[PDB]
Amino acid sequence: ISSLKQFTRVIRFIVMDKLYRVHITNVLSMLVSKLDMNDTNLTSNLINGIVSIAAFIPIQDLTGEDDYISFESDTLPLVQQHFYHIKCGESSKTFRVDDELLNNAFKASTTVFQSMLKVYVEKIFQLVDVDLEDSLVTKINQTTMILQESMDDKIFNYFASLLNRNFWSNDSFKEKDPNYELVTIPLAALVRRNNGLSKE
Amino acid sequence: GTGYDLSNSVFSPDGRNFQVEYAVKAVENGTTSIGIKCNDGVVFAVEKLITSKLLVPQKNVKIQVVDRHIGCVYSGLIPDGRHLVNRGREEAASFKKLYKTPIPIPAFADRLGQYVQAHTLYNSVRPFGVSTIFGGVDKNGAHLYMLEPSGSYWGYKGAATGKGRQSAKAELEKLVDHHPEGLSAREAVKQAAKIIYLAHEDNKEKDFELEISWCSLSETNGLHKFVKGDLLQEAIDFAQKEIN
Amino acid sequence: SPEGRLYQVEYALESISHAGTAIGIMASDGIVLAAERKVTSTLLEQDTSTEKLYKLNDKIAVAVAGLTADAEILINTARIHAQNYLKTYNEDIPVEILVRRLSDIKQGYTQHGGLRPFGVSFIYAGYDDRYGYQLYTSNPSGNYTGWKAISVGANTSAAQTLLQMDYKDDMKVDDAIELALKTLSKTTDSSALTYDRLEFATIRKGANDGEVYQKIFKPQEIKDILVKTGIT
Amino acid sequence: QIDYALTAVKQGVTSLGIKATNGVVIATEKKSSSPLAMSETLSKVSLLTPDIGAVYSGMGPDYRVLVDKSRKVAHTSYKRIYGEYPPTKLLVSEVAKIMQEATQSGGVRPFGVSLLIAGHDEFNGFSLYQVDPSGSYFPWKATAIGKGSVAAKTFLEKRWNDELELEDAIHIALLTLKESVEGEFNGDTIELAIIGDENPDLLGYTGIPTDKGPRFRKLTSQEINDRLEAL
Amino acid sequence: AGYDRHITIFSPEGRLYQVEYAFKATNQTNINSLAVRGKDCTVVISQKKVPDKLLDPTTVSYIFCISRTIGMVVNGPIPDARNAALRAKAEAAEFRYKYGYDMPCDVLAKRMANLSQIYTQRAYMRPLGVILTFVSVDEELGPSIYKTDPAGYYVGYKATATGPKQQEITTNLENHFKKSKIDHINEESWEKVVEFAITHMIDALGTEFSKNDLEVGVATKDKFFTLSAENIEERLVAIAEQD
Amino acid sequence: ASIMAVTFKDGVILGADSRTTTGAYIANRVTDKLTRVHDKIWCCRSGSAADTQAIADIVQYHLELYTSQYGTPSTETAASVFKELCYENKDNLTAGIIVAGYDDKNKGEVYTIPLGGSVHKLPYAIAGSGSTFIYGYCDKNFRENMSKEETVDFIKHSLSQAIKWDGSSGGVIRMVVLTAAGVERLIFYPDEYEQL
Amino acid sequence: MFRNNYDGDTVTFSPTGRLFQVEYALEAIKQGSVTVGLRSNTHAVLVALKRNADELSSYQKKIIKCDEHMGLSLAGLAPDARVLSNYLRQQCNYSSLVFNRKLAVERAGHLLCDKAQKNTQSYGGRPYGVGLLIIGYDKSGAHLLEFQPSGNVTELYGTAIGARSQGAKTYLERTLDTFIKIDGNPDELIKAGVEAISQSLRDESLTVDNLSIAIVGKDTPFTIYDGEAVAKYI
């Protein structure tokens, strides 16, 4: 919980130094999937990270179609090498990488946004049925609405047909007294941005 | 707040007893052990790891016998296997004393089930650190059972548990596929020896002895004898041939 | 217990200065008990309870200031000690001995600190042929004390003062009946005192001879002595 | 901690009681946890002795095992010694003592119910008592407990005089319950009992004229609907 | 501190956290069940899910025979179901011996719910993650269906359902007793009442069943028994040749 | 009393008189000395009515519970539950019991539990007060693998004698036939068994 | 720094499947002096290094007789061994009285395992904190067992436990085929036990007060040599 607070109170700054920024796609799609349904606390401290990364980052495909792309082959390999280096006592000043390779890693890192939101939405509908309450129900809606505003039409128009899709075909509103807020509101925030989606 | 996993009786917010799930991890990190149900009995096998050269060969028995006709093998915290098999016998002898017939496999299983399950009821006793594979021959043929720390138990055609769990379970499914009518009492023994030799690659660091016991209505007239001498080499030599 | 302090006790000793208000006055030829009743609703059944004035034996009685369900657990066991000292010595139990018997159970929790102390503070009024008429007190401290006149509960510190003022040793019984009511002039959070906010008791030199009658007042009998001044 | 149990009592279906000159009445609603469930299989108004009944507000189960423990204590501590059944005042005492012990005992939580116990003993006449989780108990001319507690308690002060015939108090306790009702309002979702005249009809036998039958009578699904039409 | 979430005591709003969680466990198996009344039978359908090819279906049962007369079906982890079944199988044998008549469905339920209640009021014991659905053809009341839950609650149902898709199944039944306006299924032979119970479940779950995905329990007067692999295929074959 | 049980080709048959006497007085002349502990496992009671009743009552339970958990009980098992009670309680009981039943494997099985508490498996067994008089008739007239009505007759005669000679035996003759096809209760009246 | 939440007591499983309170006990072994154990086909020997407090004090005994056919040495918590060595002394003396049968060594292994296991199921009590090398000659030859407080008892030809146990454990590992063939020689099997315990000493020097030796087998009942009796092996 500590080293997730360390990292949150410092996310905004990492998005800058042209080396660290690479890690930020990974670390996010990792936080999203590690959102627990039993640990109210771990989850509040993860949303902290997830919303901070979204507040200072555009969810956008930044690939000029450059063929080498892919998250593995190009981002993961570098991320692991940086970490291996950092772990063995060495520091990041001693870490030498080609300005070519490190910009492949960064651009290819902006691909995973799609496969990761399918996992955030999944984790939301799982949370509709938890006795998390209030403070944290709200904070979660901030993260879903901030994530939306930091989205280009390419990605957003996907996110929309994914709330639309999952809102109808779901097995997720059983348990007694649900948090409808966590799913109805994120819809409203789609219609704010795209009135056209309302007619239907 | 939290702390839902330091106490044993305690329900996590979505229905789970976490201390049990942790014990299953201790199971997964121990010797690999299996059971096969053939057409008139059961065969049991275990992986004995060899810490150093000073461990005596053939002389640290892991498979325990219950009554005269039942076999138990376990993976995990070994002393918990013993404490469980002990309560296993006190139970199988309560039964015999009063109802004369030696305790039926399915009824034996339900009795271990309740001992284990009852070790998941109070904050002040920890679950068993073993998944136990056991079985034998009763009035209506052969029965193989497996029982995890939660108290769960079911009857299997074959079963595995231990580090080499996923690996054996897969070779096990291969036989249930090829021979639906079950293996022969003798064949099941040759094969159990194969399966252990394989699920050893998941622990190939240290060396190992094999140990097999069986209970067959034709090959040991219903009793639980061990597999030894010529018939043990019969199978140790069959494994070497399907490893190379 | 930091400075020589009985914490869990003061806790309940001051929980007492909240509930109830009770008084005892020893005259030369009688004793008097009296109490105010808890925050009453219109629909609460006045006559039944006798909720804060309990009889212990034909010659002893207590006023309560504290948690009701808590004093009943005590009184039940004190009505019994009474009868055990009968079946045993065929004489009526002496007041101090009964008092000490309770005080000792109170202090029983004030030390075997594995169970929770007692609410409740008692005024005891009794007669035994060894020490004339007697008046006693019982905080959950464990201590008991002799009194010519006394009080427990809310507005305690206040009545003790009026009492100290109007009391005379030559006092009769009817003179002390007044002093008790009179000085529940002040110590009353309810502006104006009614017969229904009250419960009363007397242990006199008998309605006849040289002996000892006991009398828990029925509501009407209160509105009758209230008549002497209080309300009319 | 006792305070938190009184809180489970404060929610959970409303129930009430009214003493009269010639009878007592107690009622609550039968909120169906489903339409599939047959609500006749659960009784919120239970007989303790043939002169004494009880109703609750709060936690269902805690009431059941309290009604059971309660019937038994009536025998074990009174009937088996003195040949009579216990008087309302004292049977109530023995229940408070039961709940007061769940309080002051370790390893157990107090009960999540307030009880209204109504009855008639030959010497004390009619009486109606309330028993709280705290183990405290108070005597009532009339009161209510549960959600509708405040609305109904106020209506009872407004409508209660000490000259009520039992039929007048039945009438009241139906109105009182009509304003609070959560579900539907008929004989299938109202439970009403009375403590009135001796019912020889219901003894089960005839031949000793000294014992005359139960004062406690639980009104049938029909008797209720009949009163609600002329209501 | 914040430890009223770990034992059976009162939260500040009069809630029993540990019980509410215990309920959440009854779904952990992911089996659904329903029960119905006949003119003179009672039926319980549960799902059978056998994922491991190494299993022996015959040993996989959430339907327990408690007495000659009384059947029980559990939604919940197997270990807890057996702890309850064994205790009922014994409360009902004791009942017969002490009191001289067979133990009646609704009394067994009151007794397990009473039990389920102690767990709800004692610090040191935990409730069980099970919802016990009891059926019989009790000699006084007729077809009976009584369900108890970790909360200590019990009550009797015309019909009922339990588990994950509980409310989809429940709302199907509700709309068929709003329509026949009774308290049962007017069919004589239990066979047609079993077919009906499978039908209205296929309808409600939107998936077909094979002889291997179902467990059926049945109660007539003087017997409670379970249907074999084949005794079900017959029931399914008959549904398919009219629907 | 005066009781016996016989095995045959199709199963087992239990037989008894119906006379419980306290003293010289016949307190009940229609006693059901054939008592049921399970579908097809019954006993024959003799000795204290209060003791044999209490035991069978307690065995009926042990077996109802054994059925609940573990399944259908071997005839052998019923016997073991009887012995365990009778032997482990010998100092305070006076009961001699015959347990008999039909399973499908062995068919006819019969176990006699004398006073000691010992247990003896046999083809047929006699017991009860009036048995003493037919040890002779039975040993001479019994055969293995008899037919149903052959065995009814063997019992009718044996017991016709026991009752003639015993004052502590009499009433009607009750039988209970235990076969695959079910349980059949028999009764033969005095006007019949005396004329033999 | 790095706190532990699952090391509170013995009734608590670590998330990775570990009973920390037991792993900690298994370490108390190494907090006491070194002892060594080995066996041929005809004898079993023990060597212990008794440790002292001052120059002015006695030395802690490290070997305890159990029956005339079985004995053990301890490395670790003394009272825990006094408690276990005593239980063993009983079963041995019960198998003698009821069945007139020397209690099998293989069986006292099984019995201690289950005795120590009991102290790792229970809330409140700590695990046993001592290791035992157990020797005996039963109806089935010579025997040696290692008892760790976890319950795991294991049968060996030789081993060593405690402070610098590792010096000997590695000697014996290499000497194996040599000493298990020391049949019919008693003086020579002790010469070996002692040349092994002395790999686990630094510049440290065995004397008549440092050394404690015990032996048993075929026709030699369990005897213990402390003091001058040990001189001949130095």
Largest sheet features of chain F = 5 strands, antiparallel
Alpha-carbon distance between the termini of chain G? 49 Å
Report the span from N to C terminus of chain F.
21 Å
Characterize the overall form of chain G. globular
Total of domains of chain G: 1
Helix fraction of chain G, binned, reads 25-40%
Which oligomeric form is depicted?
Answer: part of a larger assembly
Strand content of chain G: 25-35%
List key phrases describing it.
part of a larger assembly, 7 chains, A: mainly alpha, globular, C: 232 residues, alpha+beta, 6 helices, 10 strands, 24% strand, nucleus (chain G), Ntn_hydrolases_N (chain G), isopeptide bond (chain G), phosphoprotein (chain G), ubl conjugation (chain G)
Provide structural commentary.
The structure is cut from a larger assembly and holds seven protein chains of seven kinds. In chain A, 61% of the residues lie in helices and 0% in strands. Chain A has helices at residues 2-8, 11-14, 23-33, 40-55, 71-74, 76-87, 101-109, 113-127, 135-149, 153-168, 181-193. In chain A, helix 8 packs parallel to helix 10. In chain E, 35% of the residues lie in helices and 20% in strands. In chain E, the strands form two sheets. Chain E has a five-stranded antiparallel sheet with strand order 8-1-2-9-10. The longest helix of chain E has 22 residues, at 78-99. Chain E is globular. Chain F is of the alpha+beta class and 196 residues long. Chain F has helices at residues 49-70, 75-88, 135-141, 148-165, 190-193, and strands at 3-7, 11-16, 20-22, 25-28, 34-38, 41-44, 97-102, 108-113, 120-122, 124-127, 173-179, 182-188. In chain F, helix 1 (49-70) packs across helix 2 (75-88). Chain F starts with a strand and ends with a helix. The B-E interface holds B 1-4, 7, 9-16, 37, 106, 110, 113-114, 116-118, 120-124, 145, 150-159, 169, 172-173, 176-177 and E 1-3, 5-7, 18, 21-28, 52-56, 58-60, 77-80, 82-83, 86, 124-126, 129. Strand 3 of chain D pairs antiparallel with strand 7 of chain E, so a sheet runs across the interface. Chain A: It is found in: Nucleus; Cytoplasm. Chain A: This is Proteasome activator BLM10. Chain A: Belongs to the BLM10 family. Chain A: According to PubMed:12973301, colocalizes with nascent proteasome. According to PubMed:15778719, associates with proteasome core particles and also forms a complex with regulatory particle-core particle (RP-CP).
